[PDB]
């Protein structure tokens, strides 16, 4: 008995029942979901797939044959289950015919009801078993493919010829999408054979039941596959265009958020809002065609069946002597409902098959890519794959336990020599003799997305003693302390960015820490200060490494410390000039030794569905559209039910002109209302998306700066990228499907109840059962989706990590550890996805048994209760129909809940408070040339960044003469920038008042105040587009004024050199210019602003010495007339000022002419 009970448990997915039921007390964390059975682990699947692929390559090799030889048996079994399911499912129409007409007990009309019940139960059990088996094999294939491509990545070659700039993109695409497309094709694989057979058998059954008149309907419906494929192609094209425009919009939005403070200061927030709204309008224009084609798809899907039914029954009435009997009519109707789904989804199956062919071609093209005392080399020619000898005639020697520095000119080949030693380059000749893992500090530093502690340890055992030794020797303890968490701090692309010097120091620390006898350091001092380099060499290279008697080779152009080098390698143009000790080199090569000296001298609580947010989304478009949607859908479903009831009435009898006319009118109304409802739903979706995004962008850009400082930019960009995409594309189709399924189920229930009143007694318990299933599945699946996504993200992150810095991994010999990590991550992701699919199967099976119970009850009650044969057929038809949609209603309800979560996020963002833009003072009281005078005063200023915080500035009072140069200085965190922000009003004023030109700055429309004031920040920021755009996006000044400003800033020559002059394009972040160039561009912007007041915060900061001097000259000359308030670090510049206000942790402190306070914290700083 036990094996049979276990088979039943595996058939109804009872093993997921406990998990789903426990999804209430505690969310489903990874502990609840056990580990994969050894059969489904990624290691075994990878072994099988690799074995098959190698067998293929034994005799060009095809991934298709390897995949078949690996996972053909599971899919063959799934196909067998699918065929049995189709055969049993065609017991619906046949049994409907038998029951509607009514030793051989099969015609008793009661045994047929229980036969229908059993056949339906077996059909759905087999169908769900087939789905689960195909999904299991698909996930196994995804695991195997990920492991195989990861091994190839580990075995890739780093030559620029093969691993191009887009190689990382290709690998990431393979991991993310291509493998997913192949997995989905595996999921849908049984359909490619199950659906054509089902369609052919359905058409044959229609022909047998309904005479030759079934051919017309069969052809009309079969025309539904080409149409669906055509509109699917159109949808793909429209979605590609929409994604392009959305990417442009998101680039603009990200640029806006990154540097919001500067935009708000410069009153350019609304200009960039208009710029983003232009791209949003284009995206909505594209989405209009996308939604039009989606509406056409839904209209075809819901209308072609009705047109086919109309044609079939008109032809049968006007071309067959016998009248339309009830049994045959409703059997044909059920067969049409059965065949509509295969014909609609065959297009999707074929589309995925084509995409999988493309994906496999891409994967194969990738897999066919280029790959591959202490140390002595002899007669070694190394090439990067081109064929030319990049390095020739190498006779290098690296004595054990000694320092061997390799020096040469740039482009010499030193890094190439190290990589060749590591085996990353093809060895045309020669050999490399080892007398094992070697620590490698790549010339380009590489850091994992893990924490600093893990990155520096890099998998080795933690030793606080050695950790501190390396950190102090690396001089990284201060930079570590400055981190928000110190150790255990996220870094890398996703983590907190670090300066290049910090990254290189981290990499050098990693190389030093690990226990290896050979250490390869390549230009560790490229991004380090002279003092930092000296400390690193004296403490780490000389002492720390010599303590363990390790072997170190250092590649650096800094000839300094060449005396400390036990061995020296002189290389030039890919060839060793001389190798040996400094004294030996000088004795043998006097010229070289003297040459180096020349360079030396040079210097769960909540689970309720969000109904409030759902209603808010529904009403967002407008009450008229919502009313039209509801009315159109109700009228369409009433017309469809009327069509079926009119069919029943027509078949009741047993001339036909009246019935045919009425039926044709009803079918025409049905198709017209299908079109109307599709258009209305898409219209509502479009209006909702437009309104929501418009309001969200406006509110966010108009919000306070404190919000931007608090909320990470990641969250806001996610609200603009993921939530916006959901609202645009996923919500409308999901709502359409949910409403269609809900109304179909309700109409079926109502029609069954009317035809068979007794059905309500058995409907009462099934309602409770369905409610419980709905609740439990909704919560469980909502949790499992989050689990799956959170598990998926680290997998792509790890693939990106391994793709980069491959040389570091293969130099540490830590490839095995990374491979094991990948196997663990992919196993976790696969188990998460598999259990999500298992929850789906659980729900589907329970709802299938519920539908079987509904069908049994409806059949028995209708047979018992006398009724028109047509009415009995109608009841049975709807009892079969409700079964197919009971599952989809709940699944779409869960999806709608998930998406209303995102809409709730957007709504919450809409509720953010807005800055007090409105100014108390009358606009008419603000003269146009208000800031011309330059008069400025302060009255015990007290500014707090946010309420309930200690005042950054407290009781500051000062007077500034018109057209006067004022200076500001102080130690870090002294509140210097607080005064500037108060000037601009961005930072709220806790107490006091500031008067500019005899007006209260606080009591003014903040836009006017911001526009007519000039501010320069520490790091210059440039916005994408033309130079003219950056000079004045408002376009409220003559073009020649821009040339005058450029000439004043001394940038006229640079602009002229670039093509197009003022129209020369500019890249985000100033990548098209040097830092000094960006700073002088900002200075030119301030000049063209003609504010007459200049505020500078670290203008010289991050500025070249020549850049600093030219900026100082420009400030002295151009802005002489206008007031200048300088907040700088170097006191040198402020010396030329006439009034300096130094502050210390909230105190006006010193205020007098530079000489006045020199009669003395200022003197100490100077
Ligand atoms: C992650 C998807 O894993 C599945 C995988 C399957 C296997 C499968 O050949 N389905 C047929 C549907 C059957 C009823 C015709 C199909 C065909 C084309 C497109 C999508 C689909 N299906 C995929 C979802 C959209 C409609 C049904 C079933 C169900 C699932 C599932 O979600 O649980
Ligand atoms: N990964 C690579 N793939 C292909 N060719 C490379 C690669 N790295 C360097 N080369 C080429 O090999 C030759 C020497 O490269 P190498 O890395 O030694 O440059 P370098 O400027 O001497 O380095 P360093 O920064 O250490 O001074 C040059 O032709 C360089 O273009
Ligand atoms: N966005 C902010 N929100 C709240 N407080 C801040 C913010 N920025 C700086 N502060 C606080 O204000 C004080 C003054 O810093 P400040 O003088 O502006 O720095 P800097 O010298 O770099 O200009 C600091 O001690 C800091 O903690
Ligand atoms: Mg190099
Ligand atoms: Mg500052």
CATH number for the domain harbouring residue 417: 3.40.50.300
295 neighbors 655 (Cβ within 8 angstroms): no
- Tokens 């057209």 belong to residue: 963
Alpha-helical (H) ranges within 523-622 are: 530-535, 545-547, 582-588, 590-601, 611-620
A 10 A CB-CB count for 325 gives 20
883 neighbors 852 (Cβ within 8 angstroms): yes
A 10 A CB-CB count for 400 gives 13
Q: Is 188 in the pocket of ligand 1 (CB under 6 A)?
A: yes
A 10 A CB-CB count for 226 gives 11
Distance, in Å, from the CA atom of 149 to the CA atom of 1149, rounded to the nearest integer, reads 65
521 assigned to some structural domain:
yes
777 neighbors 20 (Cβ within 8 angstroms): yes
Q: Which ligand is nearest to the CA of 389?
A: 2
Distances (CA, A) of 136 to 44, 118, 594: 14, 27, 72
Instruction: Show the CA angle centred on residue 337, arms to residues 335 and 341, nearest 5°.
Output: 115
Q: Is 1076 annotated as a binding residue?
A: no
| Orientation angle between helical segments 623-652 and 269-319, nearest 10 degrees | 10
* Ligand 3 atom 24, closest CA: 973
List all residues 6 or more positions away from 999 whose beta carbon is below 8 Å from its beta carbon: 921, 926, 930
Distance, in Å, from the CA atom of 530 to the CA atom of 309, rounded to the nearest integer, reads 86
Burial 686-719 (b: 16+ CB within 10 A, else e): bbbbbebbeebbeebbbbbbbebeeeeeeebeeb
d(CA 982, ligand 5 centre) in Å: 14
- Tokens 């303590």 belong to residue: 547
Secondary-structure percent of the chain, ordered helix, strand, coil, rounded to 5: 65, 10, 25
Distances (CA, A) of 470 to 536, 544, 792, 813, 848: 10, 8, 35, 21, 64
Burial of 436 (0-12, 13-18, 19+ CB in 10 A): exposed
Q: Is 191 in the pocket of ligand 1 (CB under 6 A)?
A: yes
1161 assigned to some structural domain:
no
Beta-strand relationship, 426-427 and 391-394: unpaired
Would you give the DSSP letter of residue 426?
E
The domain boundary residue, chosen from 515, 550, 573 = 573
List all residues 6 or more positions away from 1025 whose beta carbon is below 8 Å from its beta carbon: 1065, 1066
Q: Is 975 annotated as a binding residue?
A: yes
Nearest to 415 by CA among 596, 565, 600, 571: 571
764 assigned to some structural domain:
no
Experimental method: cryo-EM
The domain boundary residue, chosen from 573, 593, 611 = 573
Alpha-helical (H) ranges within 514-560 are: 530-535, 545-547
Distance, in Å, from the CA atom of 191 to the CA atom of 182, rounded to the nearest integer, reads 15
- Tokens 């991994």 belong to residue: 809
Domain of residue 406 covers 391-573
Distance, in Å, from the CA atom of 698 to the CA atom of 691, rounded to the nearest integer, reads 11
Nearest to 738 by CA among 629, 874, 587, 864: 629
A 10 A CB-CB count for 127 gives 22
Q: Is 180 in the pocket of ligand 1 (CB under 6 A)?
A: no
d(CA 728, ligand 1 centre) in Å: 23
Distance, in Å, from the CA atom of 104 to the CA atom of 117, rounded to the nearest integer, reads 19
Burial of 497 (0-12, 13-18, 19+ CB in 10 A): exposed
Would you give the DSSP letter of residue 1003?
S
Q: Is 413 annotated as a binding residue?
A: yes
d(CA 977, ligand 5 centre) in Å: 5
Determine the straight-line distance between the first and last CA of the chain, rounded to whole angstroms: 93
Q: Is 341 in the pocket of ligand 1 (CB under 6 A)?
A: yes
* Ligand 3 atom 2, closest CA: 945
Would you give the DSSP letter of residue 396?
-
408 assigned to some structural domain:
yes
Beta-strand relationship, 1123-1127 and 1093-1097: parallel
- Tokens 């929409």 belong to residue: 242
Nearest to 1006 by CA among 1093, 920, 913: 920
- Tokens describing residue 1042: 């821009």
Q: How many domains is the chain partitioned into structurally?
A: 3
**SS3 of 555, please?**
strand
918 assigned to some structural domain:
no
Q: Is 818 in the pocket of ligand 1 (CB under 6 A)?
A: no
Distance, in Å, from the CA atom of 481 to the CA atom of 289, rounded to the nearest integer, reads 55
**SS3 of 950, please?**
coil
Ligand 2: list residues with CB < 6 Å. 158-160, 384, 390, 410-416, 443, 523, 555
1053 assigned to some structural domain:
yes
Distance, in Å, from the CA atom of 1119 to the CA atom of 147, rounded to the nearest integer, reads 64
List all residues 6 or more positions away from 1089 whose beta carbon is below 8 Å from its beta carbon: 1012, 1014
1006 neighbors 917 (Cβ within 8 angstroms): yes
757 alpha carbon, distance to own chain's centre: 53
Ligand 3: list residues with CB < 6 Å. 709, 945, 952, 972-978
Distance, in Å, from the CA atom of 430 to the CA atom of 958, rounded to the nearest integer, reads 78
Resolution in A: 3.6
Alpha-helical (H) ranges within 373-450 are: 414-422
Determine if residue 125 is left, alpha or beta; phi over 0 gives left, psi from -120 to 50 gives alpha, anything else beta.
alpha
746 assigned to some structural domain:
no
Distance, in Å, from the CA atom of 1069 to the CA atom of 1025, rounded to the nearest integer, reads 11
- Tokens describing residue 1007: 């836009």
Nearest to 20 by CA among 7, 35, 11, 33: 33
- Tokens 């004043």 belong to residue: 1048
Atom in ligand 3 nearest the alpha carbon of residue 946: 4
d(CA 180, ligand 1 centre) in Å: 15
424 assigned to some structural domain:
yes
């Amino acid at each position: 008995l036990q094996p049979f009970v276990n088979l039943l448990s595996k058939a109804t997915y009872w093993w997921m029942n406990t998990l789903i039921i426990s999804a209430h007390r505690k969310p489903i964390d990874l502990k609840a979901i056990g580990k994969l059975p050894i059969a489904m682990r990624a290691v075994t699947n990878y072994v099988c797939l690799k074995e098959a692929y190698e067998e293929q390559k034994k005799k060009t090799p095809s991934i298709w044959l390897a995949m078949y030889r690996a996972f053909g048996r599971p899919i063959l079994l799934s196909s067998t289950f699918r065929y049995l399911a189709d055969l049993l499912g065609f017991a619906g129409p046949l049994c409907i015919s038998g029951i509607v007409q009514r030793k051989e007990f099969l015609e008793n009309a009661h045994v047929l009801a229980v036969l229908l019940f059993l056949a339906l139960i077996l059909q759905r059990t087999f169908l769900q078993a087939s789905y689960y088996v195909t999904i299991e094999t698909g996930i196994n294939l995804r695991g195997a493919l990920l492991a195989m491509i990861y091994n190839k990545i580990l075995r890739l070659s780093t030559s620029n010829l093969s691993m191009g700039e887009m190689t990382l993109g290709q690998i990431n695409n393979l991991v993310a999408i291509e493998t997913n497309q192949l997995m989905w094709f595996l999921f849908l694989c049984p359909n490619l054979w199950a659906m054509p057979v089902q369609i052919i058998m359905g058409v044959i059954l229609l022909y047998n039941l309904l005479g030759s008149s079934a051919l017309v309907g069969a052809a009309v419906i079969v025309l539904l596959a080409p149409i669906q494929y055509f509109i699917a192609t159109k949808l793909a094209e429209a979605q590609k265009s929409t994604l392009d425009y959305s990417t442009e919009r998101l680039k603009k939005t990200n640029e806006i958020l990154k540097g919001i403070k500067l935009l708000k200061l410069y009153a350019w927030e609304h200009i960039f809002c208009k710029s983003v709204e232009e791209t949003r309008m284009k995206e909505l224009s594209s989405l209009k065609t996308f939604a039009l084609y989606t509406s056409l798809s839904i209209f075809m899907n819901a209308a072609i069946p009705i047109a086919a039914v109309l044609a079939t029954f008109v032809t049968h009435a006007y071309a067959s002597g016998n009248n339309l009997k009830p049994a045959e009519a409703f059997a044909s109707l059920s067969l049409f409902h059965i065949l509509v789904t295969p014909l609609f989804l065959l297009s999707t199956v074929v589309r995925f098959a084509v995409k999988a062919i493309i994906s496999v071609q891409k994967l194969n093209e990738f897999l066919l890519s280029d790959e591959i005392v202490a140390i002595k080399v002899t007669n070694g020619y190394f090439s990067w794959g081109s064929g030319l000898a990049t390095l020739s005639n190498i006779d290098i020697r690296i004595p054990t336990g000694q320092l061997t520095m390799i020096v040469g000119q740039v482009g010499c080949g030193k890094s190439s020599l190290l990589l060749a030693i590591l085996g990353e380059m093809q060895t045309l000749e020669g050999k490399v003799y080892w007398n094992y893992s070697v620590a490698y500090a790549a010339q380009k530093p590489w850091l994992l997305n893990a924490t600093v502690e893990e990155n520096i340890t890099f998998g080795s055992s933690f030793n606080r003693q050695r950790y501190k030794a390396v950190t102090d020797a690396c001089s990284l303890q201060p930079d570590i302390d400055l981190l928000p968490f110190g150790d255990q701090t996220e870094i890398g692309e996703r983590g907190i960015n670090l300066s290049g010097g910090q990254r290189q120091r981290i990499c050098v620390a990693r190389a030093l820490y690990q226990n290896t006898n050979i250490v390869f350091l390549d230009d560790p001092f490229s991004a380090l200060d002279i003092h930092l380099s000296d400390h690193l060499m004296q403490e780490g290279i000389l002492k720390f490494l010599q303590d363990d008697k390790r072997t170190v080779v250092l590649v650096t152009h800094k000839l300094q410390y060449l005396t400390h080098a036990d061995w020296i390698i002189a290389m030039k143009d890919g060839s060793v000039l001389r190798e040996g000790t400094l004294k030996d080199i000088q004795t043998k090569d006097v010229e070289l030794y003297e040459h180096w000296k020349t360079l030396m001298n040079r210097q769960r609580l909540r689970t309720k569905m969000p109904w409030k947010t759902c209603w808010w989304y529904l009403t967002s478009g407008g009450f008229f559209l919502l009313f039209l949607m509801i009315f159109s859908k109700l009228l369409k479903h009433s017309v469809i039910v009327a069509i079926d009831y009119w069919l029943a009435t027509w078949t009741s009898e047993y001339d036909q002109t009246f019935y045919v006319a009425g039926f044709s009118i009803l079918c025409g109304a049905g198709i017209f209302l299908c079109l109307v409802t599709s258009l209305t739903v898409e219209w509502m979706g479009l209006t909702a998306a437009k309104n929501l995004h418009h309001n969200l962008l406006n509110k966010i850009i108009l919000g306070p700066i404190r919000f931007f400082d608090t909320t990470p930019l990641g969250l806001i960009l996610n609200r603009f990228s993921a939530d916006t995409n959901i609202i645009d594309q996923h919500i409308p189709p999901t709502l359409e499907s949910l409403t269609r399924s809900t109304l179909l189920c309700l109409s079926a229930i109502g029609m069954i109840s009317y035809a068979t009143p007794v059905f309500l007694i058995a409907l009462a318990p099934l309602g409770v059962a369905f409610y419980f299933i709905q609740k439990y599945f909704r919560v469980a699946s909502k949790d499992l989706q989050e689990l799956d996504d959170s598990t998926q993200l680290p997998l792509l992150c790890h693939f990106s990590e391994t793709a980069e810095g491959l040389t570091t991994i293969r130099a540490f010999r830590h490839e095995t550890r990374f491979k094991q990590r990948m196997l663990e991550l992919t196993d976790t992701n696969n188990i998460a996805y598999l259990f999500l699919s298992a929850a789906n199967r659980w729900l589907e099976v329970r709802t299938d048994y519920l539908g079987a119970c509904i069908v049994l009850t409806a059949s028995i009650a209708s047979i018992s209760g006398s009724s028109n044969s047509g009415l009995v057929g109608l009841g049975l038809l709807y009892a079969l129909t409700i079964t197919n949609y009971l599952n989809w209603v709940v699944r779409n309800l869960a999806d709608l809940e998930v998406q209303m979560g995102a809409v709730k996020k957007v709504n919450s963002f809409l509720t953010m408070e807005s800055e007090n833009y409105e100014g108390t003072m009358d606009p008419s009281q603000v003269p146009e040339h208000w800031p011309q005078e330059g008069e400025i005063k302060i009255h015990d200023l007290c500014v707090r960044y946010e309420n309930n915080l200690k005042p950054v500035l407290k009781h500051v009072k000062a007077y500034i003469k018109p057209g006067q140069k004022v200076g500001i200085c102080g130690r870090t965190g002294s509140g210097k920038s607080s005064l500037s922000l108060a000037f601009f009003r961005m930072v709220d004023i806790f107490d006091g008042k500031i008067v500019i030109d005899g007006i209260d700055i606080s009591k003014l429309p903040l836009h006017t105040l911001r526009s007519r004031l000039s501010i320069i920040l520490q790091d210059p920021i440039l916005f994408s587009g033309s130079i003219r755009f950056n000079l004045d996006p408002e376009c409220k000044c003559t073009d020649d004024r821009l040339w005058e400003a450029l000439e004043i800033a001394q940038l006229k020559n640079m602009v002229k050199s670039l093509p197009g002059g003022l129209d020369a394009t500019v890249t985000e972040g100033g990548e098209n210019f040097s830092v000094g160039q960006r700073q002088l561009f900002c200075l030119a912007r301030a000049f063209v602003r003609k504010s007459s007041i200049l505020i500078m915060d670290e203008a010289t900061a991050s500025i070249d010495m020549a850049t600093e001097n030219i900026l100082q000259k420009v400030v002295m000359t151009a802005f002489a007339d206008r007031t200048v308030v300088t907040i700088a670090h170097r006191v040198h510049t402020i010396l030329t000022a006439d009034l300096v206000i130094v502050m210390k942790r909230g105190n006006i402190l010193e205020y007098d002419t530079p000489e006045s306070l020199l009669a003395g914290v200022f003197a100490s700083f100077v």
